[PDB]
Scaffold this active site. Structure first.
Site: not given
Ligand SMILES: Nc1nc2c(ncn2[C@@H]2O[C@H](COP(=O)(O)O)[C@@H](O)[C@H]2O)c(=O)[nH]1
Ligand SMILES: Nc1nc2c(ncn2[C@@H]2O[C@H](COP(=O)(O)O)[C@@H](O)[C@H]2O)c(=O)[nH]1
Ligand SMILES: Nc1nc2c(ncn2[C@@H]2O[C@@H]3COP(=O)(O)O[C@H]3[C@H]2O)c(=O)[nH]1
Ligand SMILES: Nc1nc2c(ncn2[C@@H]2O[C@@H]3COP(=O)(O)O[C@H]3[C@H]2O)c(=O)[nH]1
Ligand SMILES: [Mg+2]
Ligand SMILES: [Mg+2]
Ligand SMILES: [Zn+2]
Ligand SMILES: [Zn+2]
Lengths: 791, 46, 808, 47
Positions: C80, C153-155, C159, C545, C585-586, C706
C-alpha cells in the site's frame, strides 16, 4: 581474427556469460548513476561527468563533452560546461568555470545546429559539413575528425548538447553507437530535468518573494517615487541575488517655463544636442541610488550625479533611457561600443563582468528610471530567468508609480483646500471696523486702536450700548424682527448672550463674542428666507424657551450657552435649497455628507468657525466642558433636520407622558435630569420648535414669513425645472401659487401641531405658542375657503 | 465543537531608521552676478 | 585464446543495443528475490529504470509498478501507498494505492478522493512512521502500541506483520510504503528490508520528480496571481468592492476551485446618537449575536459569487439574506468572529457546521471541500471573508493551496490602502470644491454694490431686471464714470490719495472703456462692473498691497500704453489682457514676502515651488475668470482666449523681481537694437515680428508698473515708502515672534531711521536700470525716470541727515 | 561597431484598459415612517 565463429562463451569463472555480465554491470552502474542525484550536497555536473566517462569508456571514443544552453536578449546560445572528459579523469580539471567558457551562438558551430534541430547529428567528416567551426580547435590546439552530438530536450526545451569526438579505433560512429548514446543521454536527460525543475522552482520562489515584499512596502505608506523605490529595492535586496545594482531616476518635467525659453528662441543659447528619451525629454539623471552588496553592505544616494559617476561612465544607462530596450551584456568591458571600465571601478578590487539594465516605464510608456544590475553573485552570466525576475520587478515599480502620483495629487489637493479655507475665513471674518461699530471703545473710552482695556470695563461699556432686554419684547413669543435692522439684530443677539449670565461666568472675551456674532451674521447668505433674520429668530425663540418657558431648569449654564450658540448657527451658510435638491443635483455637499446633508454642512462650518482662536467663543472653558459643548452643538444642529424630529416624535411624547404623571415639579426635574438621553431628546424637540416658531408668530408676521418661504421654494422649483428637467412638487411649484394657503394648513396639521401640543402639555408657560399657531391656522383656513369660492 | 484551525500568519511579512540612506531622499533641492548675490538677499528679492 | 573480452569489448555496443531494445518492452515475472539469478535481477532493474523515465503520464502508474515489483520480490501481499498531506498545520496520511498484488490491474488499486481513508499522525503505525521518518518493521501488530485496527475493521482484512518505510525528500515526508502479511514465513528479513530500501529508492526518485514539478507549478501560480492582482489594483483608485472584484476575477484561472465567494462586513464602528437613543433608554434590547474581535456586528452587506464549474456567472448579492448558500453554514460567520484560516474536508460530515448535504443551486453542485480565510486591515481588523469551495481535482485543500489563497488574501488586505486613499481623495476634493464655492460667494460683488455703480434703476426706471440692451447700459455707465482728463488718469503724476476706493473702481472701469475694448470685444457692462468690484474685494486690507496698489499698477500700465505710446507694438486683445492682468497682479496678497512663505512652509509654498505668491495671484485671477458672471473674456474665440490666458500668465509671473533681475539683459539688448534703427516703423516691425520680444517688453512693463511709485512726486512717494516700510516691519515682527529668526535690516523696526538710506540703495539698484532703459526706448517715458531721479535726491538728503545724527 | 541586439519590452502580456468589461460591475460601484407619512412627507419635500 575471423577463423573462429562468434559465440557467447560461458567463462564459468568470474562470469556466467559475456552478455549477461555486461548487462549486470551496466544495470549496476546505471543504478549508481541514478543514486548520484539523491546524494544531497552534490551537483548535477558530477552525475553528468560520471555518465560521460562511462559513455566514453563504452563507445571507445575520446573527449566527451557537454555544452549547456542559455538564452540572452531573446536569442539562444551554448557554452561549454564539461570539456575533454575522458575515462579516468578528475572532475575538477574537466569542469569549465564561468570565466573560461567559450560561447557559441546557435547559427555557428555543430553544437548550435544540434541545439536548433533538436535531433541527433552524426557527422563522420567535419570538413564536409558547413556547420563545423574551428574556434575551439584553434583555441585549444586539438584536431577533430568525427562528431556525434544529441541535444538534451525536455519539455520542448534544450538544456545541453553532449558530443563525443574522434573515435580512437574507428573512423565512424555507427548507428549502434548512436543508440547507446541516445539511451545514456536519456538517463542524463532525467538528471538534467530534475536539476532544471529545481532551478525553475527556485527562480519562481524568488520572483514570488520579490512580489510579496514589493507589495508590502508599496502599500505600507503613501510616499514619493524616491522613497518608495528605495524601500522596495532595499527590501528585495536578497532576492535579486546580484553583487551590485543601482537605479537612476530621470527628470519628468516635459515642458519648460516661459522665462527659460526666451534665450533659446532668441538664439542666445544654442539648442540642446544630445541624448533624448522617446518622449523627447533630455536624458537627465537627477538622482542615483547605489546599493553595495559585495562588501560592507553600503547604500549611497547621489543627487544630481556627475557624468563621471561609475554607473554612468559606460553608455548603457543612457542607451536604455534613449531606446527603452532590455540590455543583457556578458563580458561588458570587452565590448567596444559602450566603453565599460576595464580596470577596477573604485578603490576596492571590484570589476564589472556582466550587466543587466532595464527601464522603468510609466503608464504613458514614458521612461521614469533605469535600473542597472551588475555581475551576478555566481560567476555565470545573466540568463533569461534573471531577465524575467528583473522585468517583473521593474513592471511592479512602474505600476506603483500610480501610488506615487496619487500621493502628489493628495498633497496638492490638501494644500489647495487649506488655501481656499483660509481665504474664505479671511473674507467671512468681521473686519475691525465692523467690530468697532458695535464695541465703541474709541468714542467712549478714549483709547487708541490697540486694545489694552480691562475685560470688566469692556463688559460694562458694552452693556450700556445694547438694546434693553425688557424693551423690544426680547423675552416674549410675539417678537418680530421686521422693525429691526440687521445691525440691531447683532446687538440684540449679543444682549441675549449677556442676559443668561455666561459671559462673566465662563470669562469669554467681549471682542471675541462680538466678532463671533458678526462672523455668524456674515456667514448667512442673502437668500430670501434662510438669511440672518431667520437665524436670529431661531436664537431668540430658543432664548424665550429657556427663560420664559422655564426650560432652563432642566439644563446647566454651559448647556444653555451651547443651546443659544447652536440656535444662532443652526442654518449658517444656507444656499436656499433643501436636501432633496442636494441629492438630485449631485452637489458636492451630497457627495461629502450622506444623511442630513445641510445639517452636517452647517455643523461642520460652525465648528470650523469655533476652531479659530479669534472667533472661539468657548476659548476660556475647560477641555471636558469644550467636548460637552461640541457634542451639544452636534446634537442641536443635527436635530434641525425634520426627518429626525419625525422619527423622535414618539420618544418625546413618551417622555412628556411620563413627566405628566408626577404631581411635584421637583420630581419631574429629578426624572429628566438624571438621564442625559432624555435631556438630549427634549433638546432636539426644542430645536425643532425653535426652527418652526415662525408659524406661532402673530398673523401679520406669519403671513410675511410664509410669503418669504414660498418665494424661496418657488425659486428652488424653477431652478430645478431649468437645470434638472424635472417637474417640481405642487408645494414648490410656482404655478400653484394660489395653492399656498391650503398647503400651509396641511403644514400646520401635519408637522407643527405635535411639537407645540406636546410642549403645552409638558410646560404650561409655553401655552401661548400653541395658541398662536391655532389662530394662524384659522387665518389660513379663511384663505383656503376663499380659494374654493374663487374656483 | 469546531475542528482545530490554523491561526493567521503575520510575523513573516511584518518586518526610515531601518532603511539606510533615507535621510537624503525625502526632498531634492537643485545665477546672478557676483555683487548681486548679496544685495538680492539684502532686499529680500530672492 | 589470448584475446580475453577485447573482441567482446569491441562488439559490446551491439549487445548493449540489443539488450536495451529487447528488455525495454517485455515484462518478466519472478518470485522471492532470492531464487533469482543476477541476469533477471539486472533485467528487472532495467525495467524499473525505464519506468522511472515517464516521458509523460502520472507518477501513480510508476509507483504502482514498483509496488507490485516489491510485492513479488518480498513474498508479501497487499502492498500500500499512503500520501502525506497537511491541513491546518496538522499532518495527515491518506491512502492512494491499496492492496497491491502481483498481476493486478492499476485501476482497481487506485483510491479516489471519495473513498480515501485519512489518519492523523497520532493514529496508526503509519502516523508514527511519518512522524519519526524512520524505517519500521513490526511483527504481531496486535501487540504493538501504535497499531490502529480501524482500516482492518473497515476492509475486513487482518494484518499480522508489516514493514513500513517513509519516503522523505528535503526533510519532508511525501509517502509511506507498506508491505504486509509475509507468506510462508514471519518476521520478514534483513535482506527483505535491504531490497525494500533499494527499490523505495526508485519510488523516491519518482516521488521527488512529481513533487518538484508540483511545487514549481504552485509557485508559478502564486507568482502569476501576484502579478495579476498588482496589475489590476494599480490600474486606478477605487473602493473596496470594485477593487476586490477585479483582483478576484482576474485570477480566477489560477485558483483551482469550482466556486468561491467573498463577503464584505459593515465598516461602521460607532452609531449615531439618535440611533443610540432607543438602546440607552432601554426601549430596544441590546443586540446579542456574532461579533468580530473589534466589537462590530457581523453584517455582510454585499457578497460576490464566482461560479466556474459550469456556465460562468458572477452574481452580486447586495445585503444577502441568511438563506444564501454561503451563509447557511456557519463557516463565514465563524471566520468573521474569530479570524482563523479554516480548512474543511468532507464538509457535510461535520456536525458543528450545518453544511448542505445535497445540491444547493439545483444544478447538481454539492459542497465537498471548503477553505475560508479572513481579510484584515493594517489594524488587524476584519473587512471580509473569502470562501473557496471544492477543488477542481477533487482532492482536499492542502498546505500549498492554503499558501496560495493566504498570499492572495494578504495582498488584498494590503490593497486597502488604495481604498482608504480613494475615500480621502473624494472627501478632500469635495471639501475643496465646497470651500472654493463659498469663498466665491463671499467675494463676488452683491447686486447692491453693482447698482451703486451701474445706476440703471435710477435712469431707466426698470428697478427689477436687466432687460435693456447693452447700448443703454453703456450710455448710462459712461455718464456716471469720471472723465479721464479731469481725474488726470492719463498723466504720469496721478495720485490715488484724493479718490475713494469706490472712485477707484469707477476710474478702473473708465480705464477699461478708454482703450476701446468693451465695444470691440462685446464685454458686457454688468459683467465688467461685477468683475471690477470682485477684484477690488479680492485685495486684502494690508497696509501697502491693498486695492489702491492694484489700481495704481493698472493705471500706470494704462498710461504706458496710451501716454507712453507703447500700444504700437500690441494689438487690442493684448492690451486688454495686459490691463486686466495689471489690475490683478497682486490680488489676495497676504502681506508677506516670498521668503516668509518659504521659511514658514506655508501651504502656498508647498503648492507652488517657485514664484509662490505670483503663481497664487495668477491662479486666483484665472479662478475669477472661470466664473461666467465674472468673465469679461466671454465673447472671445478659443484661440483668443488662449492668447489672453498666456498673457495673463506671463504678466503675473513676471511681476516678481527675481525674474526681472535675471531677464534685464535681453530687454537691454532689445532696446540697444531698436535704438540704432533709422525709422520708427522699422523698430515697430522688428519688435512685432518676434513674439518673444513682445513678451520681454511686456514683462519689463510689468516690472516698471509694479515699481511706479518711485516715479511719483515726492508727496506721494513719502507716503508710499512709509506704507511699504510699515508692511516690511510687520513682516519682520511676524518673523521674530513666530519663526524665531532675526530679520534682515530692512524688515527690522529698530532700523526704522535707516529707511532713507535703504531706499537710496533701492533706487539706484532695481528701478534705475528699467526706467533708464525705458527712457532710451521711448522718449515719452522720459518724465518717469526724471521723477525717479528727483525722488532719489530727496532720500539722499534724509540719508545725509542720518549721517549727521549718528556722527554726534 | 553596432550595438548588440537587445530584447524588447513585453508590453503585450499586460497591455489589456479599465472599464466595465468585468461582469457584474454594473451593480457594484455604489450601494422608516408610517403608511400615511410615506406620501405626505414626500409631498412636503422634507425627506
Ligand atoms: N411650508 C413651510 N415650511 C417651513 C416653514 N418654516 C420652515 N419650513 C420647513 O422647515 C425646514 C427647516 O429646515 P432648516 O430651517 O433647519 O433649514 C425648512 O427648510 C422648510 O422646509 C414654513 O413656514 N412653511
Ligand atoms: N524698498 C522698496 N521696495 C519696494 C518698493 N516698492 C515695491 N517694493 C518691492 O517690490 C515688490 C514688488 O512686487 P509686488 O509685491 O508688487 O508683487 C514688493 O513686494 C517689494 O518687495 C519700495 O518703494 N521700496
Ligand atoms: N578540445 C575539445 N574540443 C571539443 C570537444 N567537443 C567538441 N569540441 C570541439 O568544440 C567545437 C564547438 O563547435 P563544433 O561543434 O562545431 O565542434 C566542436 C568540437 O570541434 C572536447 O571534448 N574537447
Ligand atoms: N485491508 C488492508 N489494510 C492495510 C493495507 N496496508 C495497510 N493496511 C492497514 O491499514 C492500516 C492503517 O493504520 P496502520 O498503519 O496502523 O496499519 C495499517 C495496516 O494495518 C492494505 O493493502 N489492505
Ligand atoms: Mg436647516
Ligand atoms: Mg507680488
Ligand atoms: Zn431653520
Ligand atoms: Zn505689486
Amino acid at each position: 581474427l575471423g577463423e573462429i565463429f562468434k559465440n557467447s562463451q560461458v567463462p564459468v569463472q568470474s562470469s556466467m556469460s559475456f552478455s549477461e555480465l555486461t548487462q549486470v554491470e551496466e544495470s549496476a552502474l546505471c543504478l549508481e548513476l541514478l543514486w548520484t542525484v539523491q546524494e544531497e550536497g552534490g551537483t548535477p555536473e558530477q552525475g553528468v561527468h560520471r555518465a560521460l566517462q562511462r559513455l566514453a569508456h563504452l563507445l571507445q571514443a575520446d573527449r566527451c563533452s557537454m555544452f549547456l544552453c542559455r538564452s540572452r536578449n531573446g536569442i539562444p546560445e551554448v557554452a561549454s560546461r564539461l570539456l575533454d572528459v575522458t575515462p579516468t579523469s578528475k572532475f575538477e580539471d574537466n569542469l569549465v568555470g564561468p570565466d573560461k567558457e567559450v560561447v557559441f551562438p546557435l547559427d555557428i558551430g555543430i553544437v548550435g545546429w544540434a541545439a536548433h534541430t533538436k535531433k541527433t547529428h552524426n557527422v563522420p567528416d567535419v570538413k564536409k559539413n558547413s556547420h563545423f567551426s574551428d574556434f575551439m580547435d584553434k583555441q585549444t590546439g586539438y584536431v577533430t575528425k568525427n562528431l556525434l552530438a544529441t541535444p538534451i530536450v525536455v519539455g520542448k526545451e534544450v538544456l545541453a548538447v553532449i558530443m563525443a569526438v574522434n573515435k580512437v579505433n574507428a573512423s565512424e560512429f555507427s548507428k549502434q553507437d548512436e543508440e547507446v548514446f541516445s539511451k545514456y543521454l536519456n538517463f542524463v536527460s532525467i538528471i538534467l530535468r530534475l536539476h532544471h525543475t529545481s532551478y525553475m522552482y527556485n527562480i519562481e520562489s524568488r520572483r514570488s518573494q520579490i512580489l510579496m515584499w514589493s507589495a508590502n512596502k508599496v502599500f505600507e505608506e503613501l510616499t514619493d517615487v524616491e522613497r518608495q523605490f528605495h524601500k522596495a529595492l532595499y527590501t528585495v535586496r536578497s532576492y535579486l541575488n546580484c553583487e551590485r545594482y543601482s537605479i537612476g531616476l530621470l527628470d519628468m518635467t516635459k515642458e519648460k517655463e516661459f522665462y527659460d525659453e526666451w534665450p533659446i528662441k532668441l538664439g542666445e543659447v544654442e539648442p540642446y544636442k544630445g541624448p533624448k528619451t522617446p518622449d523627447g525629454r533630455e536624458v537627465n539623471f537627477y538622482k542615483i541610488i547605489d546599493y553595495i552588496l559585495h562588501g560592507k553592505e553600503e547604500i549611497k544616494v547621489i543627487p544630481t550625479p556627475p557624468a563621471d559617476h561609475w554607473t554612468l561612465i559606460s553608455g548603457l544607462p543612457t542607451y536604455v533611457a534613449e531606446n527603452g530596450f532590455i540590455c543583457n551584456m556578458m563580458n561588458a568591458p570587452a565590448d567596444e561600443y559602450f566603453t565599460f571600465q576595464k580596470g577596477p571601478v573604485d578603490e576596492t578590487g571590484w570589476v564589472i563582468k556582466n550587466v543587466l539594465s532595464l527601464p522603468i516605464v510609466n503608464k504613458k510608456e514614458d521612461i521614469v528610471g533605469v535600473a542597472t544590475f551588475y555581475n551576478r553573485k555566481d560567476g555565470k552570466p545573466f540568463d533569461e530567468h534573471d531577465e524575467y525576475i528583473t522585468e517583473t520587478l521593474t513592471q511592479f515599480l512602474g505600476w506603483s508609480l500610480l501610488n506615487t502620483d496619487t500621493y502628489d495629487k493628495m498633497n496638492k489637493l490638501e494644500n489647495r483646500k487649506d488655501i481656499a479655507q483660509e481665504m474664505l475665513m479671511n473674507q467671512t471674518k468681521a473686519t475691525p471696523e465692523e467690530i468697532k461699530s458695535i464695541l465703541k471703545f474709541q468714542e467712549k473710552l478714549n483709547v487708541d486702536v490697540i486694545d489694552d482695556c480691562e475685560e470688566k470695563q469692556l463688559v460694562a461699556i458694552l452693556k450700556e450700548d445694547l438694546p434693553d432686554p425688557r424693551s423690544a419684547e426680547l423675552y416674549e413669543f410675539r417678537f418680530s424682527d421686521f422693525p429691526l435692522t440687521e445691525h440691531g439684530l447683532i446687538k440684540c443677539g449679543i444682549r441675549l448672550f449677556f442676559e443668561i449670565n455666561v459671559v462673566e461666568k465662563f470669562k469669554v472675551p467681549v471682542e471675541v463674542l462680538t466678532r463671533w456674532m458678526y462672523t455668524v451674521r456674515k456667514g448667512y447668505r442673502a437668500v430670501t428666507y434662510h438669511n440672518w433674520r431667520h437665524g436670529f429668530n431661531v436664537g431668540q425663540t430658543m432664548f424665550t424657551l429657556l427663560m420664559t418657558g422655564r426650560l432652563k431648569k432642566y439644563y446647566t449654564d454651559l448647556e444653555a450657552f451651547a443651546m443659544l450658540a447652536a440656535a444662532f448657527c443652526h442654518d449658517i451658510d444656507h444656499r436656499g435649497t433643501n436636501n432633496l435638491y442636494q441629492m438630485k443635483s449631485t452637489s458636492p455637499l451630497a457627495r461629502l455628507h450622506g444623511s442630513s446633508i445641510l445639517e452636517r454642512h452647517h455643523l461642520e462650518y460652525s465648528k470650523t468657525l469655533l476652531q479659530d482662536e479669534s472667533l472661539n467663543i468657548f476659548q476660556n472653558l475647560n477641555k471636558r466642558q469644550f467636548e460637552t459643548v461640541i457634542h451639544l452643538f452636534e446634537v442641536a444642529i443635527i436635530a434641525t433636520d425634520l426627518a429626525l424630529y419625525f422619527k423622535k416624535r414618539t420618544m418625546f411624547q413618551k417622555i412628556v407622558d411620563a413627566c405628566e404623571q408626577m404631581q411635584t415639579e421637583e420630581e419631574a426635574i429629578k426624572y429628566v435630569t438624571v438621564d442625559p438621553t432624555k435631556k438630549e431628546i427634549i433638546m432636539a424637540m426644542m430645536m425643532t420648535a425653535c426652527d418652526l416658531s415662525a408659524i406661532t408668530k402673530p398673523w401679520e408676521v406669519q403671513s410675511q414669513v410664509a410669503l418669504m418661504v414660498a418665494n424661496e421654494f418657488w425659486e428652488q422649483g424653477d431652478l430645478e425645472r431649468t437645470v434638472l428637467q424635472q417637474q417640481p412638487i405642487p408645494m414648490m411649484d410656482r404655478n400653484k401659487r394660489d395653492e399656498l394657503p391650503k398647503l400651509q394648513v396641511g403644514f400646520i396639521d401635519f408637522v407643527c401641531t405635535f411639537v407645540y401640543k406636546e410642549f403645552s402639555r409638558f410646560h404650561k408657560e409655553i401655552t401661548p405658542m400653541l395658541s398662536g399657531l391655532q389662530n394662524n391656522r384659522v387665518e389660513w383656513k379663511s384663505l383656503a375657503d376663499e380659494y374654493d369660492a374663487k374656483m | 465543537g469546531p475542528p482545530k484551525f490554523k491561526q493567521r500568519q503575520t510575523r513573516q511579512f511584518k518586518s526610515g531608521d531601518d532603511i539606510p540612506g533615507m535621510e537624503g531622499l525625502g526632498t531634492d533641492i537643485t545665477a546672478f552676478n557676483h555683487l548681486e548675490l548679496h544685495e538680492l538677499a539684502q532686499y529680500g528679492i530672492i
